[PDB]
């Protein structure tokens, strides 16, 4: 009969004593019990949200979040757990009291030029989901293929310097993909436990690819970690030009996507909705590489970085260490501030770092 009893929520509670994710810092038995039975309309559950954080006590190179979203409803169905995490992840930003404003106008940028001797590369990046389609962690094969078709068709309409063709991973050979990776264009097959535990590596490489303009200064990653990933790169230190191309291409892509009736996932309290709560808000991760020896003279590096709200990864990916001195220095926060604001902050921070080389 219905007299049969279920396992009490505490019987399922994760053992997070040794873990260090930002999820474990905020998952309490009360919250887990509250959300144990809920679910998003597509079947996403809390356990699926917190699985990746549960499996990984921490990351060797940078503090993580520990949870991913399955669709747009997750950020509201499971808000009670997420909002404290989003607040902690983005320094002092309540995701239930204040709103988020997005400005993609590069005309307001200042300076934007780095000492080419010290910065080498200049990149900007973002991401965009498609409403009505499950996010990569939870998306089925059909949903992923639908995302791929929508973006491929929409991007086919781009004209001018932002013109190219879409190369599907299933077509590229190992050598070509490896060359694109080593060139810092393509994305790597997901082997990190933080991605495979979240479910973002199912059915690889099906329905995933890259669309890059002829000069490869404007790239789009389809179905790697997010639905979309709009990158603009230029080997140099003219952040202004790369950012200008990035925003122009972003506006064009948005136009050509809405022309077909689709719309990018978005809500006022959060901005563009992305899988990992780290990327919430603007998704923007404007940043540069750095000449090794010039910035290799750094004693209190992490303290200054934290003061400047800058992340320090390795040249080769977040999952790699910095060798020789080349530090992939990017911005930390993505939500709350606007894209122009974040890029100006990155410009000021990197210029400050250059001024502090003091060889």
Ligand X SMILES: CN(CC(=O)O)C(=N)N
- Annotated binding residues for ATP, written as ranges, equal 121-125, 184, 229, 285, 313-318, 328
Question: Shortest approach of ligand X to residue 200 CB, angstroms?
Answer: 8
Q: Does 213 bind ligand X (CB under 6 A)?
A: no
Q: Which of residues 297-316 bind ligand ADP (CB under 6 A)?
A: 313, 316
Q: Does 64 bind ligand X (CB under 6 A)?
A: yes
Is residue 285 exposed (0-12), middle (13-18) or buried (19+ Cβ within 10 Å)?
buried
What does the alpha-carbon distance between residue 275 and residue 334 come to, in Å, rounded to a whole number? 13
Of the candidates 212, 227, 240, 285, which one interacts with ligand ADP according to CB under 6 A? 285
Which of a copy of itself, ligand X, ligand ADP, none sits in contact with 316, Cβ below 5 to 8 A by type? ligand ADP
- Identify the CA nearest to 192 among candidates 181, 183, 200: 200
Contact 85, 277 (CB under 8 A): yes
What does the alpha-carbon distance between residue 24 and residue 185 come to, in Å, rounded to a whole number? 34
What phi, psi does 220 have (nearest 5°)?
-135, 125
| Size of the chain, expressed as the number of residues it contains | 359
Compare residues 42 and 351 and give the one whose CB is closer to ligand ADP. Answer: 351
Please measure the distance between the N-terminal and C-terminal CA atoms of the chain and give it in whole angstroms. 78
Compare residues 77 and 288 and give the one whose CB is closer to ligand ADP. Answer: 288
- Of the ranges 36-44, 276-284, 289-297, 340-348, which one interacts with a copy of itself (CB under 8 A)? 36-44
Which of a copy of itself, ligand ADP, ligand X, none sits in contact with 123, Cβ below 5 to 8 A by type? ligand ADP
What does the alpha-carbon distance between residue 186 and residue 86 come to, in Å, rounded to a whole number? 29
What does the alpha-carbon distance between residue 28 and residue 51 come to, in Å, rounded to a whole number? 15
Compare residues 5 and 159 and give the one whose CB is closer to a copy of itself. Answer: 5
Name the residues that contact ligand ADP, by CB under 6 A.
121, 123, 125, 181, 184, 285, 287-289, 313, 316-318, 328
């Amino acid at each position: 009969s219905e007299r049969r009893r279920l396992y009490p929520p505490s019987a399922e509670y994760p053992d997070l004593r040794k873990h260090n994710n930002c999820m474990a810092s905020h998952l309490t038995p009360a919250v887990y019990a509250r959300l144990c039975d809920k679910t998003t309309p597509t079947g996403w559950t809390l356990d699926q949200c917190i699985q990746t954080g549960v499996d990984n006590p921490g990351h060797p190179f940078i503090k993580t979040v520990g949870m991913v979203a399955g669709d747009e409803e997750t950020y509201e169905v499971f808000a009670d757990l997420f909002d404290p995490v989003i607040q902690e992840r983005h320094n002092g930003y309540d995701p239930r009291t204040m709103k988020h404003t997005t400005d993609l106008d590069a005309s307001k940028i200042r300076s934007g030029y780095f000492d080419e001797r010290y910065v080498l590369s200049s990149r900007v990046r973002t991401g965009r989901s498609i409403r009505g389609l499950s996010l990569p962690p939870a998306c089925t094969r059909a949903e992923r293929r639908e995302v791929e078709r929508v973006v491929v068709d929409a991007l086919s309409g781009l004209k001018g310097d932002l013109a190219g063709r879409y190369y599907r991973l299933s077509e590229m050979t190992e050598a070509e993909q490896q060359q694109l990776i080593d060139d810092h264009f393509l994305f790597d097959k997901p082997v990190s436990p933080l991605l495979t535990a979240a479910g973002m590596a199912r059915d690889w490489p099906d329905a995933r690819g890259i669309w890059h303009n002829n000069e490869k200064s404007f790239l789009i990653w389809v179905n790697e970690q997010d639905h979309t990933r709009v990158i603009s790169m230029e080997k140099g230190g003219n952040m202004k030009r790369v950012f200008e191309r990035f925003c122009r291409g972003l506006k064009e892509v948005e136009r050509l996507i809405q022309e077909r009736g689709w719309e990018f996932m978005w809500n006022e309290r959060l901005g563009y909705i992305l899988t990992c709560p780290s990327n919430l808000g603007t998704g923007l991760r404007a940043g540069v590489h750095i000449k090794l020896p010039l910035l290799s003279k750094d004693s209190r590096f992490p303290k200054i970085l934290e003061n400047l709200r800058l992340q320090k990864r390795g040249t080769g990916g977040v999952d790699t260490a910095a060798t020789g001195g080349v530090f992939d220095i990017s911005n930390l926060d993505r939500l709350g501030k606007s894209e122009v604001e974040l890029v100006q902050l990155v410009i000021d921070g990197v210029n400050y770092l250059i001024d502090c080389e003091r060889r």
